[PDB]
Structures are given as C-alpha cells and as structure tokens.
Design an enzyme around this catalytic site. Structure first.
Site, mmCIF file in Angstrom:
data_model
loop_
_atom_site.group_PDB
_atom_site.id
_atom_site.type_symbol
_atom_site.label_atom_id
_atom_site.label_comp_id
_atom_site.label_asym_id
_atom_site.label_seq_id
_atom_site.Cartn_x
_atom_site.Cartn_y
_atom_site.Cartn_z
ATOM 1 N N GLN C 14 0.823 -1.204 0.000
ATOM 2 C CA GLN C 14 0.000 0.000 0.000
ATOM 3 C C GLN C 14 0.860 1.257 0.000
ATOM 4 O O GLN C 14 0.576 2.209 -0.737
ATOM 5 C CB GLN C 14 -0.944 -0.016 1.202
ATOM 6 C CG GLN C 14 -1.918 -1.187 1.179
ATOM 7 C CD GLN C 14 -2.975 -1.139 2.279
ATOM 8 O OE1 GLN C 14 -4.011 -1.797 2.174
ATOM 9 N NE2 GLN C 14 -2.715 -0.374 3.340
ATOM 10 N N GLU C 70 -0.618 -13.141 0.575
ATOM 11 C CA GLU C 70 -2.049 -13.155 0.320
ATOM 12 C C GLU C 70 -2.361 -12.258 -0.873
ATOM 13 O O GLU C 70 -1.676 -11.252 -1.092
ATOM 14 C CB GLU C 70 -2.819 -12.694 1.566
ATOM 15 C CG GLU C 70 -3.824 -11.574 1.362
ATOM 16 C CD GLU C 70 -4.468 -11.143 2.669
ATOM 17 O OE1 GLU C 70 -5.025 -12.011 3.378
ATOM 18 O OE2 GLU C 70 -4.400 -9.939 2.994
ATOM 19 N N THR C 178 -2.549 -4.315 14.272
ATOM 20 C CA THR C 178 -3.174 -5.419 13.549
ATOM 21 C C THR C 178 -3.094 -6.741 14.296
ATOM 22 O O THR C 178 -3.820 -7.676 13.934
ATOM 23 C CB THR C 178 -2.527 -5.587 12.163
ATOM 24 O OG1 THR C 178 -2.729 -4.396 11.392
ATOM 25 C CG2 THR C 178 -3.121 -6.770 11.410
ATOM 26 N N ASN C 205 3.885 4.416 13.362
ATOM 27 C CA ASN C 205 2.511 4.750 13.016
ATOM 28 C C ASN C 205 1.865 5.679 14.036
ATOM 29 O O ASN C 205 0.919 6.393 13.688
ATOM 30 C CB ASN C 205 1.684 3.478 12.872
ATOM 31 C CG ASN C 205 1.636 2.975 11.441
ATOM 32 O OD1 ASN C 205 1.804 3.739 10.489
ATOM 33 N ND2 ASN C 205 1.401 1.683 11.283
ATOM 34 N N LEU C 251 22.914 5.134 -3.500
ATOM 35 C CA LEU C 251 22.510 4.482 -2.258
ATOM 36 C C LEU C 251 23.659 4.394 -1.264
ATOM 37 O O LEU C 251 23.433 4.417 -0.048
ATOM 38 C CB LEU C 251 21.967 3.085 -2.559
ATOM 39 C CG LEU C 251 20.521 2.993 -3.053
ATOM 40 C CD1 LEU C 251 20.180 4.081 -4.052
ATOM 41 C CD2 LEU C 251 20.275 1.614 -3.665
ATOM 42 N N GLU C 253 25.802 6.589 -0.588
ATOM 43 C CA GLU C 253 26.041 7.861 0.081
ATOM 44 C C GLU C 253 25.158 8.037 1.311
ATOM 45 O O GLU C 253 25.533 8.765 2.237
ATOM 46 C CB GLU C 253 25.822 9.015 -0.897
ATOM 47 C CG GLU C 253 26.457 10.322 -0.455
ATOM 48 C CD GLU C 253 26.403 11.394 -1.528
ATOM 49 O OE1 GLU C 253 25.942 11.091 -2.649
ATOM 50 O OE2 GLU C 253 26.823 12.539 -1.251
#
Ligand SMILES: Nc1nc2c(ncn2[C@@H]2O[C@H](COP(=O)(O)OP(=O)(O)OP(=O)(O)O)[C@@H](O)[C@H]2O)c(=O)[nH]1
Ligand SMILES: Nc1ncnc2c1ncn2[C@@H]1O[C@H](COP(=O)(O)OP(=O)(O)CP(=O)(O)O)[C@@H](O)[C@H]1O
Ligand SMILES: Nc1nc2c(ncn2[C@@H]2O[C@H](COP(=O)(O)OP(=O)(O)O)[C@@H](O)[C@H]2O)c(=O)[nH]1
Ligand SMILES: COc1cc(S(=O)(=O)Oc2ccc3[nH]c(C)cc3c2F)cc(OC)c1OC
Ligand SMILES: [Ca+2]
Ligand SMILES: [Ca+2]
Ligand SMILES: [Mg+2]
Ligand SMILES: [Mg+2]
Ligand SMILES: [Mg+2]
EC number: 3.6.5.-
Lengths: 54, 422, 437, 343
Positions: C14, C70, C178, C205, C251, C253
């Site tokens: 997501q 899933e 969750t 979160n 990457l 750096e």
C-alpha cells in the site's frame, strides 16, 4: 559557520555547513537452518499422528 | 477462505439450524437458496459459508449429523430445511441415549466414517479451506461423544486447518439427564487437545438471561437458542462480511490464544433481546462487558481477561466506539492482564443484525472461565466418588481409569487457568 | 544507474502504491506509463530512469516488485488506476497470508515462494546496466512484512553482496495495530535483518496518526491518509536518486553521510510543514520556520526527545523555494536556542540539499500544496527510545512465554527468541555507549 | 476517575500525595508495572521517560522533569554555571567552584590552583570546602594538598567557604534556608510561602565540623544542643522575619527573599529549553529544594538544588496539598504559593 562543497545544478543545489570540528552467511547456511526448521515441524507433526494412532 | 460447518446431535442441529436461518437472512438468501438482497456486501464473502450451485443457488457448506433421525427430520421440515444439501444429511437410527461412550466408541464408530466422506467431499471443493466449525452440546451423547470423535478424526486428516467449536455446556437448571457432568468432562478433555477455538455456551447463563434479564418465567429451548443465534451471528460477522481486518479463523486463534490449552472463550452480546429505542455506543459497551450479558455464567471480575475481541455492528461513530472501549480498559484495568499489551481488539461492521440498529458482540479469553470447569468438575466428582451411573459407560466398554484421567485433565485445566490469574 | 524497490506485505504494498503514485505525479508520468516529457522513448540515461525503465512503446515502468503471501492487497494494484504501469510479472501473490506469525512468513509459507521472488527480482536486475541496490518497504508487525522480508534480506545479501539495501520500516502502534504478537515479530525481524540492511528509515505509526489528527484535522486517520503522508517523506529521501543533484546521489552515500556505525543505521526523519488542504489559504512558513520545526518532536516520524540524545549525522533535504543563505541563517539561529549536542568524534555540522521543484501533492488529497518543505535526516541516539518501548512489550509477553507456541509450531525454536532479544539489548547498549554525557 | 501509579516508596512527600489522591475518591492506584496510568510518581533513578505519552486516549503526567539532573548534581551544576550565558561564569550569587576528578580517574585541577594562590598572596581569607553527590564525606581546609589528596582518598567539587556567614545573635550560630519550588507542566515557577531554617546549635568557630555543617542529621547526631533555641533546629519564616526586624532592622521579604526569588528564576529559565515538556507527548512537573546561605551583608548564596526534597513535618499537610492543587489537578480536574513570573 563555513559553507563548503557548493554544488549547483538546474534542479537544485547542495552544500555542507560545518559548525564545529570534531573533538554475511552463504546460501548453504541459510538452507541448513531453513530445512532444519521443517524437520522440527515435521517431527512435531509425526508425534501428533503417533499420539492420535494410540 | 471457505469454512465447513458441522452440527451434531439434538442441540447441535437445533442451534446450528438457527445459525443458518439467521445468516441466510443477513445475506439475503431465501429458504430455496436464491439471493434476494440489496447490498453487494452481502455476497462479497458469501463463499465462506455457502457453495454456489447451478442457477445462482447458494447451498450452505454444512453437514448435519445425528445418531437419531428425529431432530434431523424436523430440520428438513423446518423453515430453512429445503436449503441444505440432501447428501449432507448423515444419520443413524439407534441413537446415543445421552451416553458419551455410545457416541464416541460404539454407535458413533459405526457412523463416523460416513460423515468424513461428506467432510472430504466438501473440503475437496474448497479453494482455500481455513477450518471447520462444529455446533454441539457436551451434555448429551451424540454431539458430545461422536462430535469429539469427529474432531479427533478430522484433525488427523486436516492437521493444519483450524478447528472451531460452539460447545453448549450442561447445567442442572436446564438438564436432561444426571450423567451430563460425565459426558461434559469427557468432552472437555477432547476439546482441550483438539480445538483451536471453543466458544463456551453455558445453558446456565442462557437460562438466567432469559429468566432474570428478559423476564421470561419459563424459558424454553427456543428461547435459549435465540440467544445462541444472536451470538453465533456476532462472532462470525468478521468472517461473513468484508472489513479492513481480513479476519480469518487462524488470525483469531493466534491473537486470542496465548497458551494452546487456554482457548475457551466467554462470548457476550448486547443488547439482550427476546425494543424500538436505539442504543448508544456507551450503552453497548457497558452492557457488553456486564456479566449479565455473558453466555458462560462466570463473573469476569473474579478473573482476568487474557485477550478480548469486540465487534460493533451498525452505523455509529467509530471514534466514539474507541472513546468508550478505551474507557472500559482504563476503568477496569485490573481485570485485564498487564503482561499482554493491546489485548483488546475492536472491529466495526456497518451492517446491523436483523431487528436491531446497534449491536455489539464480545469474545473474551478470561481466566474466570475456570469457574465453569470447576462447576462441571464438582458435579462430576459428586457422582464419581460413588461410581454412580458408571454402569451405563462400562457396559459400552469404557473403564473407570478413563474417567479418572478426564477428571485429572479437568482439574489440571483449572490449575492452568489459575496460574495466569495472578 | 538503477534502483530496485521491493514492497513486502500489506503495508509495503500500500505504501509503495502511494509512493509510485507520487513519483508519477512528480515526474509527470501518466497512469498508462506514458511520460510526454521523455523525448528519448525507449532509452534515456536521465536521473528518473533509475526508478523507471523505458519500453519500446515509450512506457515508463517502475523498477518495482510487490510481494504478499495473500492476494487481496495486490489485486487492488492490478485493478487500480495505476494498473497499466506494472506488468503482472512484478506483482507476486500467494494464497494464505502468514496470520501475523513471523515464523509462518519466514520458515513455512515464505520458503515456498522465496525462489520465485528472487527470480522475478533477477528479471529486473538483469535490466540494469549498473544496479545500485534495493529499497525494501515492509512493516515490522505483519507476518509477511517481518518473516518474508528477513528471509529475502538474507538471500539478497548472498545474490547481490555488493549492492546496498535500504529499508523503509513501519514501527507498530496500538492506534492502528493489527495483532498482539506484533512486538515479537518486530524483534525477530530486526535481529535477522540488522547485519544485512545498510540503512533503515523507521516510521512509527503513532507519529503519523497524531500528525494526521493534529495538523490535518482528521479525526480517524485511514491507512490512505497515513500512506499519503509517508510517501511525501519517502519522496524527500528518494528525491536525490530520481532527480539531478549532488547530495545522496547513490545508495552508498546514505551510508556515508548518515551511518558511521553500521549497527546504528536508523536515521530519525522529521518532515515539515504538514498543512490541511481544507484550509483555504495557510500562512506559508518560512525557511527558518520549517527548519525549526525539524526539532519539534511533534513533527518526527518516531516519537522521541532528541534533546536527550547526541547526534552523529544530520542531513537537511529542502524542496521548493529555498536559497542557501536562508538555510545558513536558520541553522545559526536554531543552534543558539536548541540544544544540539553531537558526539565528540563527529563534526557538529549539517549536509544540506535543495531541490527547487516544490513538494508535489495528490489531487484531492489532504496535504496542501506548500511552496517550501524540508525533511531532516538526523542519526540521533534518541531513537533508541523506540527500541526500549518495543523491548519492554517483548519482555512482558515473553516472561510468561505468551503466544510462543504459535511460532515453535511452525519450526522455530524457543531459543531463537532469546537470541533475537539479547541482540536487541546489545543494540540498546551501543546506543548508550554513544550517548553518555 | 483518574489513574495513578507509585514507584517511589521512600518518598515521604509523595507518600502523602498518594494518600490525598485516594482520599478524594476520584483517583485510583494501580500497580507500578501497569502501563495504563494517567499519572506516575516515578522513582529517582532510571525513570523510563521513553515509555511515556504512548498510551492512546491517556494523558500521562510524571512528577519529574527529564534532564533536571543537570541542576541537582554537584558536578553538573558547576558545569552548568559558567557554560550557560544566562548563568554566566560571573554569577554573583554562586560561590566560586571548580570540578575536580580524582587522580585515579573535563577536569579543572590547574584552574582551581589558579584562583587559590591569588588569595594567599593577596592576604585574603583562603578557606575552601570539598563535597560530592555521594555524601551522607566533606572536608574544610585552608590548604590545597589537603583537599585534593582527600579527593583522591568519584567526581568531587571544591568551592569557596563562607568564612563570613550571617550568625543569629541568640547563640551565634549558622542557619541554612530551604525553599520549596514547584514547576508544573506549564513551567510556571511556584515558590512555597513557607520555608525552614536548619539552624545550628554550636557557635561558629573560624579556627571541628559541627558548627560548620547545618544538616539536620549532623545536628541530631554530633551536636548536643539540638533543640536548645528552636524546635528540631528548624526555624520557620515567621520566627526568622521577626529576628531580622528586632536585630538588623529589616525584613525577610526584602533582605533575603528578593534574592532567593531571583536565584530560583535564573536557574529554571536557564534549562527551560532543555527540559520543558510543552510540545512533548508527555507532561512533567517536579518539586525542588533550594538550599541558600546568607552572609553578614545580607547576601544570599546558592548551595545546592535537590530533585527529591523532604518537606518539614508541620508543612507536609499544607505543601503536599498544594502539589495536587496546581500540579496534578491542573491537568486532572476534580493560595500558598508565590508565582515567579517570567517569559
Ligand atoms: N503506515 C501503514 N501501516 C500499515 C499499513 N498496513 C498495515 N500497517 C501496519 O502493519 C502492521 C501489520 O502488518 P501488515 O503489513 O498488515 O501484515 P502483512 O505484511 O500483510 O503480513 P500478514 O500477517 O501475513 O498479513 C500493523 O502494525 C499495521 O499498523 C499501511 O497501509 N500503512
Ligand atoms: N560554600 C559553603 N560555605 C559555607 N557553608 C557551606 C558551603 N557549602 C556547604 N556548606 C555547608 O554544608 C552544609 C551541607 O552541604 P550540602 O547542601 O551539600 O549537604 P546535603 O547534600 O546533605 C544538603 P540536603 O540534606 O538538603 O540534601 C550546608 O548546610 C552548609 O552549612
Ligand atoms: N441450548 C440448547 N441446549 C440443548 C438443546 N437440546 C439439548 N440441550 C442440552 O444439551 C444436553 C443434552 O444434549 P443433546 O443435544 O440432547 O445430546 P445428543 O442429542 O445425544 O447429541 C443437555 O445439557 C441439554 O440441556 C437445545 O436445543 N438447545
Ligand atoms: C472471526 O472472528 C474475529 C476475528 C478477528 S481477526 O481475524 O482480525 O483476529 C484478530 C486480530 C488481532 C487481534 N488482537 C486481539 C486482542 C484479538 C485479535 C484477533 F482476534 C477479529 C474479530 O473481532 C475483533 C473477530 O470477531 C468476530
Ligand atoms: Ca527516456
Ligand atoms: Ca551487507
Ligand atoms: Mg435430547
Ligand atoms: Mg496480510
Ligand atoms: Mg543530609
């Protein structure tokens, strides 16, 4: 308070501002632990069927 | 993720019959199997409990088992009798005589193989079978004896699928025979070993709720089964209707069962119904956690909640749902274990049950459930210490030692539920 | 050069779906993958080609790989608005998820699909003249996001031992939880990924939820609100890779500028300003105002107190109408009021990067368009608070061995728990040895 | 109903605050390890601030300000002064002090000997004193090697001794003013209108360590004249103020308190940007104990600041209630203080 490395371009610019000076495992080892986990998972299962057989 | 339903015995088929009569309405399925609803949410997860047939017919993934043909003839003649798959009626004739031995060892043995053929046929047509759910009583002979036999045999063949049960506990207040403690104790041992999730439905609680709360002077089994239907609808809401939690049986067990043997849940429901006033969110929460809305006849305040899962149904402020849920935890923080963070889970479904605008169902893994097993154990010992009525079981081949084991296994379970209460 | 983004689990898919949405908006790539700006159809050695390959038809295809045990979450990418961007070979799905069980995603359901994921990854790696590394999006708490991610990081470290691996990780929060076993998975996956990830960006979160509530006035933030905010920060961090520049151009750096100690590779991100698009017009903050905000805990991606933690590195990534003189004045004035104590073995300085292009926002989103924004990456020892919070929850459940049987039933050993935890105690020791007064 | 926990059993002050909260009937005491609390009376050492402000729908308050140890420890206080522009090296009310590390173990050894030789060659009184946070071990000497060897015999500090202290004529003894300060979540600085004077019992002798140290423990242990003049060797502001009027023809508000209120404001405004919890996910309050010393010209000095003070027996009731009124109920609703205004 010293600006250094002033790089500039069309899309932007970057710099650095110093304010004070200073004062892996192999594929086999993976498969070994992985397969070893399925062995415990299949042994714990076998014990269940052996228990159910009784 | 499909679920295979099984109902065994008089109680198992009568509560199971009502379960399908209820959810069928909630999904818009008429007794013929045709869908006549309005919301597509009704059908997004219809495959969980129904198989789609030719001509857009929906046939329940249910199997009806009994050692007598009586209770199953009524089902076929009942309101939603024509919807069940005819091949999935598996019955004997001699019956179990309210004897666990007859259902588990002698008469059920003759019939158990035929049942598994239907279970196997149903599982073969399941894209991703998640588990089985059984409805039965522990006090009789068929649902108790044969039902646990099926559970044991189903595990041997589907060891990696979740075994769920709705298990009706016996009570002297609602009693058919004095050997109900014998049958229940033998069954509990089986459930401890061979189930992931057992919803403890105590007939003592159902009776008191009908008598005290609902003000029914003489409850009938139909009155008690209305309570069971409301609960069974509530605890399957997250399975049957879409949500943001993608709920399945395995997830429920992982989060609700901290220890494999302590998987016996106290179900609760609010508002208790037998009616026009809508119920506010704080009212649902208070009643839901109130002991008078528990279906297991245990005082939650005498124990501690290991884990809790609550489902609110209807149009309501999810923010308010939180405000009132966290309030209970922060108020009765002594009745929740401090060593399992975030041990209370809340889900909301916009679709309310038939007849209500606001409802809330509650699933509790409380250590107070030991009161129930202690009650069964005391009733069991009161007879076993004098070997009373044992001849009914020893005549079917059982030995006294098997009782002494189930007695010990029962007492051990109580001790396990106790150690986690301190 | 090229960078391969890998999105694992629900949160990774997501959030990745939100990032590539924002990349397309910032690069002007249409939902059918057609970029009118690109005049080198089929080729292009430009800076945005690090994240997008070009087909013969002129389609800009993300260099991405979405994975989930899933199929429900990735199906929305297949039937979503940006379905045309990817080809089905990049969207890998299983049948059964991990049921929030790290062991189920690492040892049992993961091992069944790891070989396929790597092959699909190789299908993109071979399309890279020089591959820099991988950007791994995943959650700590998810069964797939923790178990399968750690397995993949072990295998990538073998098949791409030279390439770098960066992490974008979602630290669990009860507000949007969750599962109750999330602390267990967060600890198991950090222990098994530490030696393999070269630099990891944690997002709590809790921080995003509170930021959405306070700054965007969203009573009940959805994953959409969170992801749209997270993608803005990810965009600031990855902007240097997709646009021409000189700071954090590859990457490797990120490691040089932000990771002096390999095990302390968890830079703390702070973003500003977050303005509610509902506001008709907001008082656009100044360069000094947004810079100061980088030192307010309320704007950090992890709730902690940088005052009680010594800094080791600090990057300021401005985006919009920003000029160097404004930045220097803000830095000088913020030194006096704030308490920014670096380590004695690092210079007390700031590496700054400005991209004139203003921060992009999704049409119809919650984030207002601002004229200047800044994302600060400060490798501060204060972020160890998050490890302590997470470790205490771990010790509470593990004292009673709660839920452990679920993991041993998949093949895991009870010892692997204490092994992972003792490693976390060592990480908390390292943070302290670097932050003593 | 409000939720609170307890993690400091030896707190005589907050043992009283815990009593009052329960007595209201609107507060509940949980167990020390329960994460769901509205308030914590945390321990002195290793208070887990990193775990606070992380409970949904739970406003959490703690009775300690994180980072306040910079002011409540001997070594850090001296290092805070000087290095702080607000509390400049030229702090008139802070006794000259230097941080000394033991030889076995930055350090300010050569700087201490710098401002020492000036007084010997300048004929000035050159008496110094050494102490540490590990005290009940203190030494008062006019030599250098004696104090520095005593340090070698953890981190210690050496400051100038008040060789000219103010002495109460009815006895010719030395007192020690203790003022209680409360800082709430808003960082309002509240000074308790009632203070104590841990007076001595022996005559100050400028030529023995009983008439020099005014701790209530030393007076109750080494001194024999405990309680001769005032009860428990603890005078209150009402008695002291009257003595200032009859003897020095002045008052307590002007000659002493004006300075005390200034010292309190300067210290707490200095570390305000380092401990303030205004925009933090949890809130903090804390009670402090300032120990002052007054010299013969009626000038107040700063001795030490304590983060866990012990209140007087008489004033426990009036104070500990004031803690609840302005620090606990200000955020959790259900004067005896002087508010020191500032910016
Ligand atoms: N920020 C953010 N966090 C998310 C999102 N989706 C899930 N999470 C967080 O991720 C954690 C759970 O991990 P998931 O990604 O949902 O699980 P998974 O990777 O699919 O693994 P499974 O357990 O097998 O389903 C929880 O703490 C959630 O708060 C998202 O879209 N955005
Ligand atoms: N510079 C100085 N000049 C004169 N006397 C001093 C002094 N420094 C300390 N003292 C004396 O030493 C005594 C105790 O010192 P300090 O305040 O360090 O002890 P302590 O830490 O036991 C106090 P509390 O009991 O309040 O914690 C003071 O009461 C004072 O009489
Ligand atoms: N709730 C409920 N309980 C029942 C019902 N029928 C029987 N019981 C209970 O179950 C026990 C008898 O079990 P029963 O179902 O008749 O056994 P079986 O037919 O041999 O499987 C007793 O404790 C009864 O109180 C019913 O329809 N509903
Ligand atoms: C079908 O049964 C249900 C299944 C689920 S779930 O699949 O999301 O499992 C979970 C996930 C996280 C959890 N945390 C805790 C403390 C419990 C818990 C849990 F059970 C949730 C349900 O209601 C909340 C539910 O009730 C009908
Ligand atoms: Ca191109
Ligand atoms: Ca490496
Ligand atoms: Mg019957
Ligand atoms: Mg998932
Ligand atoms: Mg003392």
């Amino acid at each position: 308070m010293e600006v250094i490395e002033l790089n500039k371009c069309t899309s932007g610019q970057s710099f650095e501002v110093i304010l004070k000076p200073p004062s892996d495992p192999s594929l086999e080892e993976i498969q070994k632990k992985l397969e070893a986990a399925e062995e415990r998972r299949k042994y714990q299962e076998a014990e269940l069927l052996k228990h159910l057989a009784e | 993720r499909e679920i295979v339903h099984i109902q065994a015995g008089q109680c198992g088929n009568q509560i199971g019959a009502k379960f399908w009569e209820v959810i069928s309405d909630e999904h818009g399925i008429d007794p013929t199997g045709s869908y006549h609803g309005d919301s597509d949410l009704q059908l997004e997860r219809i495959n969980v409990y129904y198989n789609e047939a030719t001509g857009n017919k929906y046939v329940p993934r249910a199997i009806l088992v009994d050692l007598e043909p009586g209770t199953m003839d009524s089902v076929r003649s009942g309101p939603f009798g024509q919807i069940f798959r005819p091949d999935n009626f598996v019955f004997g004739q001699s019956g179990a005589g309210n004897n666990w031995a007859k259902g588990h060892y002698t008469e059920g043995a003759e019939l158990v193989d035929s049942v598994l053929d239907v279970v196997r046929k149903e599982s073969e047509s399941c894209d991703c079978l998640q588990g089985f759910q059984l409805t039965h009583s522990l006090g009789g002979g068929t649902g108790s004896g044969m039902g646990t036999l099926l559970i044991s045999k189903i595990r041997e063949e589907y060891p990696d699928r979740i075994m769920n049960t709705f298990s009706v506990m016996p009570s002297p207040k609602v009693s058919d025979t004095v050997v109900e403690p014998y049958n229940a104790t033998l069954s509990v041992h089986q459930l401890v070993e061979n189930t992931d999730e057992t919803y403890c439905i105590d007939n003592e609680a159902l009776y008191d709720i009908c008598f005290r709360t609902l003000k029914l002077t003489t409850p009938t089994y139909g009155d008690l089964n209305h309570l069971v239907s409301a609960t069974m609808s509530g605890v399957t809401t997250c399975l049957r209707f879409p949500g943001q939690l993608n709920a399945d049986l395995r997830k429920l067990a992982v989060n609700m069962v901290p220890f494999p043997r302590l998987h016996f849940f106290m179900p609760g429901f609010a508002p208790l119904t037998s009616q026009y006033r809508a119920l506010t969110v704080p009212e649902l929460t208070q009643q839901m956690f109130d002991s008078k809305n528990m279906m297991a006849a245990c005082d939650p305040r005498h124990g501690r909640y290991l884990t809790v899962a609550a489902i609110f149904r209807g149009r309501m402020s999810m923010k308010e749902v939180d405000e009132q849920m966290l309030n209970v935890q922060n108020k009765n923080s002594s009745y929740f274990v401090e060593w399992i963070p975030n041990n209370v889970k809340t889900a909301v479904c916009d679709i309310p049950p038939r007849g209500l605008k606001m409802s809330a169902t509650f699933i509790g893994n409380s250590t107070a459930i030991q009161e129930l097993f202690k009650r069964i154990s005391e009733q069991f010992t009161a007879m076993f210490r004098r070997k009373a009525f044992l001849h009914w079981y020893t005549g079917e081949g059982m030995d006294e030692m098997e009782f002494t084991e189930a007695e010990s296994n029962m007492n051990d379970l109580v001790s396990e539920y106790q150690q986690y209460q301190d | 050069r090229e960078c391969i983004s890998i999105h694992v689990g629900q949160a990774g898919v997501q959030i990745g779906n939100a990032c590539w949405e924002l990349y397309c908006l910032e690069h002007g790539i249409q939902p059918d993958g057609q970029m009118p700006s690109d005049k080198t159809i089929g080729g292009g050695d430009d800076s945005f080609n690090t994240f997008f390959s070009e087909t013969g038809a002129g389609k800009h295809v993300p260099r991405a790989v979405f994975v989930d045990l899933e199929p429900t979450v990735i199906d929305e990418v297949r039937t979503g608005t940006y379905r045309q961007l990817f080809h089905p070979e990049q969207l890998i799905t299983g049948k059964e998820d991990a049921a929030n069980n790290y062991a189920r995603g690492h040892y049992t359901i993961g091992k069944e699909i790891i070989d396929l994921v790597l092959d699909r990854i190789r299908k993109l790696a071979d399309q890279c003249t020089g591959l820099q590394g991988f950007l791994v999006f995943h959650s700590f708490g998810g069964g797939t996001g923790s178990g399968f991610t750690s397995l993949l990081m072990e295998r990538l470290s073998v098949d791409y031992g030279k390439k770098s691996k960066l992490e974008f990780s979602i630290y669990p929060a009860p507000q949007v939880s969750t599962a109750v076993v999330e602390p267990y998975n967060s600890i198991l996956t950090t222990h098994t990924t530490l030696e393999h990830s070269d630099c990891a960006f944690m997002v709590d979160n809790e921080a995003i939820y509170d930021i959405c509530r306070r700054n965007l006035d969203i009573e009940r933030p959805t994953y959409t609100n969170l992801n749209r905010l997270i993608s803005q920060i990810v965009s600031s961090i990855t902007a240097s890779l997709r646009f021409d520049g000189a700071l954090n151009v590859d990457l490797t750096e990120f490691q040089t500028n932000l990771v002096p100690y390999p095990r302390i590779h968890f830079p703390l991100a702070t973003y500003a300003p977050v303005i509610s698009a509902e506001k008709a017009y907001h008082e656009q903050l100044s360069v000094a105002e947004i810079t100061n905000a980088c030192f307010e805990p309320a704007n950090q991606m992890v709730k902690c107190d940088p005052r009680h933690g010594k800094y080791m590195a600090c990057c300021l990534l401005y985006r919009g109408d920003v000029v160097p003189k404004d930045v220097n004045a803000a830095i000088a004035t913020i030194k006096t009021k704030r308490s920014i104590q670096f380590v004695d073995w690092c210079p007390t300085g700031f590496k700054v990067g400005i991209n004139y292009q203003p921060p992009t926002v999704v049409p119809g989103g919650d984030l207002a368009k601002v004229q200047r924004a800044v994302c600060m990456l400060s490798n501060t020892t204060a972020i160890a608070e998050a490890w302590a919070r997470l470790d205490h929850k771990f010790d509470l459940m593990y004292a009673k061995r709660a839920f452990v049987h679920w993991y041993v039933g998949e093949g895991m050993e009870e010892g692997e728990f204490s092994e992972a935890r003792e490693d976390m105690a060592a990480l908390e020791k390292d943070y302290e040895e670097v932050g003593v007064d | 109903m409000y939720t609170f926990v307890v993690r400091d059993e030896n707190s005589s002050v907050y043992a009283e605050v815990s009593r009052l909260l329960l007595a209201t009937g609107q507060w509940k005491r949980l167990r020390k390890d329960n994460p769901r609390f509205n308030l914590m009376l945390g321990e002195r050492n290793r208070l887990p601030f990193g775990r606070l402000g992380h409970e949904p729908g739970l406003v959490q308050l703690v009775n300690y300000y994180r980072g306040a140890d910079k002011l409540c420890r001997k070594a850090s206080l001296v290092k805070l002064i000087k290095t702080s522009p607000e509390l400049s090296e030229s702090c008139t009310w802070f006794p000259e002090s230097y941080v000394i590390y033991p030889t076995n173990l930055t350090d300010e050894r050569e700087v201490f000997l710098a401002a020492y030789n000036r007084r010997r060659e300048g004929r000035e009184g050159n008496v110094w004193i050494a102490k540490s946070s590990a005290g009940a071990g203190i030494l008062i000497s006019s030599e250098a090697s004696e104090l520095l060897d005593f340090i070698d015999e953890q981190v210690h500090v050496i400051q100038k001794y008040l060789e000219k202290p103010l002495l109460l004529e009815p006895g010719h003894r030395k007192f020690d003013i203790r003022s209680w300060v409360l800082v709430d979540h808003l960082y309002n600085i509240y000074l308790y209108r009632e203070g104590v004077l841990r007076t001595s019992s022996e005559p100050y002798n400028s030529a023995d360590k009983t008439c020099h140290l005014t701790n209530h423990c030393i007076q109750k242990e080494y001194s024999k004249n405990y309680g001769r003049y005032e009860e428990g060797n603890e005078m209150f502001f009402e008695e002291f103020n009257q003595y200032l009027m009859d003897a020095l023809n002045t008052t307590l508000e002007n000659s002493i308190l004006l300075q005390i209120k200034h010292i309190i404001r300067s210290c707490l405004m200095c570390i305000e940007p380092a401990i303030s919890t205004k925009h933090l996910h949890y809130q903090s309050f804390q009670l402090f104990g300032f120990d002052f010393m007054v010299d013969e010209e009626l000038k107040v000095w700063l001795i030490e600041v304590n983060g866990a003070p012990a209140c007087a027996q008489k004033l426990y009731a009036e104070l500990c209630q004031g803690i609840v009124d302005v620090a606990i109920s200000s955020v959790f609703p259900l004067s005896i203080f002087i508010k020191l205004h500032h910016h």
